Amino acid sequence: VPSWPQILGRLTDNRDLARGQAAWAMDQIMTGNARPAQIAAFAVAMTMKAPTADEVGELAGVMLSHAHPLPADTVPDDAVDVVGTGGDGVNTVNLSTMAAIVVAAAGVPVVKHGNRAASSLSGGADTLEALGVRIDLGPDLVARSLAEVGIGFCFAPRFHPSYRHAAAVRREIGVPTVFNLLGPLTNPARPRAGLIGCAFADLAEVMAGVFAARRSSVLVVHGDDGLDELTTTTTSTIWRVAAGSVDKLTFDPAGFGFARAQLDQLAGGDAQANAAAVRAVLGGARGPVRDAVVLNAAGAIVAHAGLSSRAEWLPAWEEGLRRASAAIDTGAAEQLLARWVRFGRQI
Amino acid sequence: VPSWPQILGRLTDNRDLARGQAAWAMDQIMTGNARPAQIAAFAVAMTMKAPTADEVGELAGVMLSHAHPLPADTVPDDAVDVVGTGGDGVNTVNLSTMAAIVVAAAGVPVVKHGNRAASSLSGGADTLEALGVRIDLGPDLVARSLAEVGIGFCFAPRFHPSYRHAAAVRREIGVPTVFNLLGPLTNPARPRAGLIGCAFADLAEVMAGVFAARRSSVLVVHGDDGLDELTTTTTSTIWRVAAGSVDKLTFDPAGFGFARAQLDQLAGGDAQANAAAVRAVLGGARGPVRDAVVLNAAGAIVAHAGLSSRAEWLPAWEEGLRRASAAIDTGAAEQLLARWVRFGRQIL
Ligand SMILES: O=P(O)(O)OC[C@H]1O[C@H](OP(=O)(O)OP(=O)(O)O)[C@H](O)[C@@H]1O
Ligand SMILES: O=P(O)(O)OC[C@H]1O[C@H](OP(=O)(O)OP(=O)(O)O)[C@H](O)[C@@H]1O
Ligand SMILES: Cc1ccc(N)c(C(=O)O)c1
Ligand SMILES: Cc1ccc(N)c(C(=O)O)c1
Ligand SMILES: [Mg+2]
Ligand SMILES: [Mg+2]
Ligand SMILES: [Mg+2]
Ligand SMILES: [Mg+2]
Numbered sequence A: 001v002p003s004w005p006q007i008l009g010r011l012t013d014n015r016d017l018a019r020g021q022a023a024w025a026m027d028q029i030m031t032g033n034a035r036p037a038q039i040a041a042f043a044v045a046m047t048m049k050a051p052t053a054d055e056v057g058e059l060a061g062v063m064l065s066h067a068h069p070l071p072a073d074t075v076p077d078d079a080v081d082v083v084g085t086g087g088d089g090v091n092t093v094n095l096s097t098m099a100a101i102v103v104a105a106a107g108v109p110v111v112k113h114g115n116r117a118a119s120s121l122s123g124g125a126d127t128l129e130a131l132g133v134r135i136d137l138g139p140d141l142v143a144r145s146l147a148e149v150g151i152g153f154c155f156a157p158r159f160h161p162s163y164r165h166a167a168a169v170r171r172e173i174g175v176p177t178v179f180n181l182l183g184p185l186t187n188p189a190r191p192r193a194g195l196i197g198c199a200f201a202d203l204a205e206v207m208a209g210v211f212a213a214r215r216s217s218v219l220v221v222h223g224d225d226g227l228d229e230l231t232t233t234t235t236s237t238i239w240r241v242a243a244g245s246v247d248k249l250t251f252d253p254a255g256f257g258f259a260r261a262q263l264d265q266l267a268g269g270d271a272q273a274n275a276a277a278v279r280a281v282l283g284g285a286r287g288p289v290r291d292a293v294v295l296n297a298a299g300a301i302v303a304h305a306g307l308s309s310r311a312e313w314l315p316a317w318e319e320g321l322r323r324a325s326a327a328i329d330t331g332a333a334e335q336l337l338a339r340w341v342r343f344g345r346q347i
Numbered sequence B: 001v002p003s004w005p006q007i008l009g010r011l012t013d014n015r016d017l018a019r020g021q022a023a024w025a026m027d028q029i030m031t032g033n034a035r036p037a038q039i040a041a042f043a044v045a046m047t048m049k050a051p052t053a054d055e056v057g058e059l060a061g062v063m064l065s066h067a068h069p070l071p072a073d074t075v076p077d078d079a080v081d082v083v084g085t086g087g088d089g090v091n092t093v094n095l096s097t098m099a100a101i102v103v104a105a106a107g108v109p110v111v112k113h114g115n116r117a118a119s120s121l122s123g124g125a126d127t128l129e130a131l132g133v134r135i136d137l138g139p140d141l142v143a144r145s146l147a148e149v150g151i152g153f154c155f156a157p158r159f160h161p162s163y164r165h166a167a168a169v170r171r172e173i174g175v176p177t178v179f180n181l182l183g184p185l186t187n188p189a190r191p192r193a194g195l196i197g198c199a200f201a202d203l204a205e206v207m208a209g210v211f212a213a214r215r216s217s218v219l220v221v222h223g224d225d226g227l228d229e230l231t232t233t234t235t236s237t238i239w240r241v242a243a244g245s246v247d248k249l250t251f252d253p254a255g256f257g258f259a260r261a262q263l264d265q266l267a268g269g270d271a272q273a274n275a276a277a278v279r280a281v282l283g284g285a286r287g288p289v290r291d292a293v294v295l296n297a298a299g300a301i302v303a304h305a306g307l308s309s310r311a312e313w314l315p316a317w318e319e320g321l322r323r324a325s326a327a328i329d330t331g332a333a334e335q336l337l338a339r340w341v342r343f344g345r346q347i348l
Helices: A004-012 A021-030 A036-049 A053-065 A095-105 A124-130 A139-149 A161-173 A178-185 A204-212 A271-282 A288-305 A313-329 A332-345 B004-012 B021-030 B036-049 B053-065 B095-105 B124-130 B139-149 B161-173 B178-185 B201-213 B271-282 B288-308 B313-329 B332-346
Strands: A080-084 A110-114 A151-155 A193-197 A217-223 A236-242 A245-251 B080-084 B110-114 B151-155 B193-197 B217-223 B236-242 B245-251
Touching (some): A004 A036, A004 B036, A021 A036, A021 A053, A021 A161, A036 A161, A036 B161, A080 A288, A095 A271, A095 A332, A124 A151, A139 A151, A161 B036, A178 A204, A193 A204, A193 A288, A204 A217, A204 A236, A204 A245, A217 A288, A271 A332, A288 A313, A313 A332, B004 B036, B036 B161, B036 B178, B053 B178, B080 B095, B080 B178, B080 B288, B095 B110, B095 B124, B095 B151, B095 B193, B095 B288, B095 B313, B095 B332, B124 B151, B124 B271, B178 B193, B193 B201, B201 B217, B201 B236, B217 B288, B271 B332, B288 B313
Parallel strands (some): A080 A110, A110 A151, B193 B217
Antiparallel strands (some): B217 B236, B236 B245
16 A cells, blocks of 8 residues: 555655665655655655666656656667766766767767766767767667667656656755656666766765666776776776676776876866867877776776677686777767768758 | 755755755755755755754754744743644544643633644644644734633644745655654743653653743653653653753653553544543543643643753642642633633624
């Protein structure tokens, strides 16, 4: 007999929910049946209790049930995502978006989920738009983009219209909640591999748990400097997910010869400034931003290699770094972005 | 510059707020500038972080600044309230309301803050209405009632119209929050003494701290059976507020000769049934309901005595118990209710 008083009371008592209660709540939210006060109370209470992977799995699974899917047999079995929670508070260039282009240029199919800025100056979607990429395509044209260009972009508001009540509440209250975890967990193309950034150190493990219950090869990553990306300024924590299990480890890019960078060297600006940074990297400019892009692209290539799991961790990294660099140095990435822009103009 | 993201982020980080932040939030809420989502997020976050006396003091002070006051010089310096949070989830007769009548009949001015039921079958206000008492009077008439009858009732929605945004959110989410503490702390007549029940054991101390900052003479009470009243079924915890400090006590009514009652002996029903229980007690019927009323009335009289605090605890209780018993057995309590009903009927 589920209800808001029952579910909110359990959370405010600091108890995990019974199985199915988070799903009930999320379905009320997604069908327009929850009052904004109830949505907010639920989001905050779940956040302060500390959500479990089972609970977040219910939230994401319900949200996916209401999403627009891509057409049958249009997403390759080995498609990868590169996306994070955001909310790291650091205002960087768009590392995930740049890595995604590089990964696609390396020959790995990419279906990227993304959205505009929430609290940074330019989000991945804003920057793609400033580059001339069409961010607003429906299921059929995202599938065509993927088939014709090797990359597609699923704009969250276009694919998750029923999330609008939750989204408005998120904007009204501003504070990060458990809802900030859901974007990376609800890519409507349901790719089985991903490099997934988490700004919230204590929730990365929960996100990894969600992925472990799916048929997935994922690196969930948190930079020990706070970034929702693999960082070049220090070590990162990685939760490797494969075969239904998790392997937590400390990762140090100095092992691959990367110089230690400063956070300010990765600083971004508005959409035009961040778009310029994309073009600079794809044109071969050497430096800290490139290094961070190559590191993250390699990470996504390692996640992808985990699907057809021949190679071991270290060799997979060495190959990922070689492929990511070559994709830039040979012009493939610059060429792939141009092709993606062309595709959107030819629609 | 205070803001929702700032304030809510601090609470979700499990930090106490900076001075002024809770006041800002409450002023947004009281002016209609807070979205329902913001109100709910704040109420829940403040609850799960665990509110401090300073924070609740800010909420209550802002709320009072928006309330209708009584007219100047109409509330005696020694007026008392008898009121609790409710939310104990035990169906009982209206113990605070009955005690309030008995206290007034003992010659202690009572200005009661109250409201309808939120969870229970009949709240104080509902039962008073069933007895024929006019509960919906403005400031001038509550003042007149206090003067002519010895008791007045401030009906919370009449005195706190700007709380309507918060009250709506409270109903929508159902779960108890820090807002459930505010009733007893926002009596618009500002009596300086009271017997204040708290259903939430871990928050009684916080409520006591707010009264300590006001230098009120107050007993904040929680029955160890969960009641937001002094109980007769077992011991109670009392946070005694005197001279601006709080000390915590275990109270056992057995020491005053009270037999242990069972919770079902205090069971209530709808407004008509609880009105009958009131009439039975005031007519002098013995038994567990009278015992509980007498105990709580004495507690309020003890709090009142603490305003002139040469207050040896056990003798204060002994005199309080005697005064409450006499107020019933002389007929004064039954007579006072009749006077109160008469006053309301004269208004037309
Ligand atoms: O404004 P914030 O909350 O900090 O978030 C900044 C971006 O991070 C996330 O995207 P993603 O990882 O796809 O993009 P990026 O790493 O390329 O910016 C999010 O969807 C935003 O677009
Ligand atoms: O429905 P609940 O949330 O359980 O609350 C029951 C009653 O308790 C409070 O009043 P008070 O202590 O003034 O009244 P009483 O006479 O019923 O004790 C509250 O305003 C309700 O009238
Ligand atoms: C950020 C986000 C994601 C999905 C949505 N439906 C919306 C929305 O409707 O505003 C917003
Ligand atoms: C408890 C309480 C206090 C003031 C109100 N206006 C309301 C209300 O509008 O329902 C409720
Ligand atoms: Mg990112
Ligand atoms: Mg980032
Ligand atoms: Mg009461
Ligand atoms: Mg009670």
